[PDB]
Amino acid sequence: PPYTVVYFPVRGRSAALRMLLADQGQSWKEEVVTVETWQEGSLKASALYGQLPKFQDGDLTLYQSNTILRHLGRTLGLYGKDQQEAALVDMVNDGVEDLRAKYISLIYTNYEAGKDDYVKALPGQLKPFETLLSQNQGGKTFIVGDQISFADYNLLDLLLIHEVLAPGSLDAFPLLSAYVGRLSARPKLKAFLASPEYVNLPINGNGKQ
Amino acid sequence: PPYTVVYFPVRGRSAALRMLLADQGQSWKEEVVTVETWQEGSLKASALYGQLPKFQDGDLTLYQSNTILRHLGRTLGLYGKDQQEAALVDMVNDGVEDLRAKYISLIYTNYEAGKDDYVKALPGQLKPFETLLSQNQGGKTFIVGDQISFADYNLLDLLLIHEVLAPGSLDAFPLLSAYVGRLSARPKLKAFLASPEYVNLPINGNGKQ
Ligand SMILES: CCCCCCSC[C@H](NC(=O)CC[C@H]([NH3+])C(=O)O)C(=O)NCC(=O)O
Ligand SMILES: CCCCCCSC[C@H](NC(=O)CC[C@H]([NH3+])C(=O)O)C(=O)NCC(=O)O
């Protein structure tokens, strides 16, 4: 630390890292980049893949949302208790990333045309996270082990946004409904999710949710 | 260990994790899964995300290619010498991953109508790794730091398949170029890249490369 998130006035691929910081009792600066600022071409030109988020941690500069997440898991001890759990944390997040890339591509690339095909495939896509949960202490704690990981935040954000896209898509998944239900209640995380820092922001950058 | 890779008879997403093992002088078994056996559906059904590659390491069963990359870097010490190097290695891999997604979506979804545009875009897509490899002792060792990482096996394969795509695609990048020969000159890799079980193996499995 200190932490700075440099991003568009959208939740997008920073919603989960932001949650993590907040749940962890941490504080950060929000650097905001409007499309106008981005349209200047100054930020993009330095950015390693011409894309945001950008994260500064003390004197360390990072791109890629999952790098940032992994770096915070590695520093705040949110990467499982051991080398097995490390691997299972990854498996979970890689799975989140896969569904998220699908979600993004629907939203930005063809929303109204694909929504039906997307939401149809959704139960099949959520079932492995129910399974995962049911194979660890009975879905009673976290997605991996019995302490919180970066994969938990990234997955929490995945389900929240999906409840907006497809109201009631978690009915069929009891363990997962209680898990969003429980993890939201975590005191600092309740507060963060109610902050205008979050609430004032739309999920996506194109009107679509 | 011991190691087992379960996958279709292609290079695909088990290509980078096999170079790693070979160069690391390690050995492994192959569970070949033809398309016809996959259509039977009992393997599909048991896989966490219904997909391959699948990997067994001693008692651990893993899915997700980068998870197997990460698991391997962590056990064999191919994840940078420190915390910062770790975060940059992930930054490379995520960037490799992003170009692999796009190539995979060219190969399987619109090869015939996508290609000229794709190769058109290749230089300005390969440049980010040319940069990183510059800002790291002038390009003379590895993508990150001075010892090999899982991010180097993944990028190396990414660069090899793209040479098959458009032969001579790497000339506008003389740095990324010698990188490829350095890594393939490594006696353990060299020999595997000359074995049939690498040369006789299809890249993508749909007659397109
Ligand atoms: C312009 C409004 C965009 C706001 C929507 C979300 S950011 C979209 C895009 N960034 C990304 O796709 C980030 C992906 C990156 N691989 C990650 O996971 O962090 C971007 O910076 N795009 C700009 C560019 O690539 O030039
Ligand atoms: C004909 C030979 C083709 C083999 C190459 C395709 S393997 C493609 C697919 N696997 C994946 O997309 C893996 C994605 C995963 N995110 C990873 O990187 O490990 C799969 O198991 N697909 C099968 C399915 O989903 O039914």
Side-chain angles (χ1 to χ4, degrees), chain A residues 134-171:
Chain A
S134 86
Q135 288 181 347
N136 185 40
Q137 304 161 66
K140 286 256 283 186
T141 43
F142 311 96
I143 199 70
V144 173
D146 76 339
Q147 77 194 10
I148 207 166
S149 65
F150 66 85
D152 281 293
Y153 300 99
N154 199 12
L155 168 66
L156 179 70
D157 179 69
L158 183 70
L159 305 152
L160 299 153
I161 65 173
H162 279 88
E163 260 291 8
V164 170
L165 185 64
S169 50
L170 263 43
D171 288 330

Side-chain angles (χ1 to χ4, degrees), chain A residues 91, chain B residues 46-49 51 53-55 61-65 67-68:
Chain A
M91 194 155 62
Chain B
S46 55
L48 172 62
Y49 302 109
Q51 284 203 318
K54 169 176 177 198
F55 189 81
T61 308
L62 267 12
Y63 302 98
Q64 291 284 0
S65 43
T67 291
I68 305 148

Side-chain angles (χ1 to χ4, degrees), chain A residues 94-95 98, chain B residues 7-10 12-13 33-35 38 44 49-54 63-68 97 100 104 108 203-206:
Chain A
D94 279 358
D98 283 349
Chain B
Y7 198 49
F8 303 103
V10 303
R13 287 190 172 271
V33 186
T34 49
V35 189
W38 186 249
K44 212 230 197 317
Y49 302 109
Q51 284 203 318
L52 311 188
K54 169 176 177 198
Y63 302 98
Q64 291 284 0
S65 43
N66 301 122
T67 291
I68 305 148
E97 180 55 16
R100 185 176 293 277
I104 285 163
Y108 299 107
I203 300 169
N204 292 319
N206 67 344

Side-chain angles (χ1 to χ4, degrees), chain B residues 98-128:
Chain B
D98 290 2
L99 180 54
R100 185 176 293 277
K102 294 160 151 210
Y103 160 101
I104 285 163
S105 174
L106 186 87
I107 294 301
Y108 299 107
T109 302
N110 89 127
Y111 183 80
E112 262 62 46
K115 188 152 167 203
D116 298 344
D117 281 37
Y118 184 92
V119 196
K120 217 82 90 82
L122 226 222
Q125 214 60 194
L126 288 180
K127 207 196 266 192

